[PDB]
Write a protein that binds this DNA or RNA. Sequence first.
DNA 1: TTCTGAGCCAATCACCGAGCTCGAT
DNA 2: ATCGAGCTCGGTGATTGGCTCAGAA
Lengths: 80, 92, 62
Amino acid sequence: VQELPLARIKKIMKLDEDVKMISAEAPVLFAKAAQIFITELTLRAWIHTEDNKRRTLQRNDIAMAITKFDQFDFLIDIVP
Amino acid sequence: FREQDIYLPIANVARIMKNAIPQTGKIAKDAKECVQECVSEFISFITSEASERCHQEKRKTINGEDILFAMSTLGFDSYVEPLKLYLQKFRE
Amino acid sequence: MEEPLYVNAKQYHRILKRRQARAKLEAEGKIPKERRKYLHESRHRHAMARKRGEGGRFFSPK
DNA sequence: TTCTGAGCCAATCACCGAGCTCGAT
DNA sequence: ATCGAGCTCGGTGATTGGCTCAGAA
């Protein structure tokens, strides 16, 4: 039911010059992966929003989840 | 390079974000913009491992196994089954 | 910007090459440094054109 | 407290997906 | 043979901003 542009997921993978041909199944997997990712990042960040007694989730909520989870370590110079 | 060429649509991102939270809740623009950047990094991140392992096996096309393997390699091993599962209800 | 095993062990080496990839795109290609207010000239002109109801919203029938 | 910034509407049109042709494995 | 890049084409949902008061400060 959910969705995300497959074409766009591809366009993004193909930013890399080393990445030349891509199977059909791949974006399809990524659609769902990104969906789980975006889902479980937000979920984590919101804790930090409630912790602080806000009702708006904000940039810095996010950074505060990234710093508190090893699996997300790869975004470090993404969000300083 | 345009924004539309390198990020997922913001409204698609917000939609999902908004699902993850109290229905009453709110989200900063800068917050959405941010996850949007992340998700794009996440896409690129798995790929470069997959591209490494995929060219390392003397192939030219990044496929299913490639991703999943890359995910195990980088600690997303938890995502692995639910994808596989979701990978059996859309293909033939 | 630099560090050793003070990050997920599993992930370390990738982060590193992906730093390289970007530092390339930055140096050479085109990574937009800042966000644009809007994305398409036409969708801007159209949003500016739309009749608006009360509250600055779009409208709806009555 | 003061005052910044997110949600709310839905109509156009850029972009996505479903068809293709062609060249590779 | 199968399976992907790259066109084209037509159908459609992301994109879009002004006023108001949640709610960040």
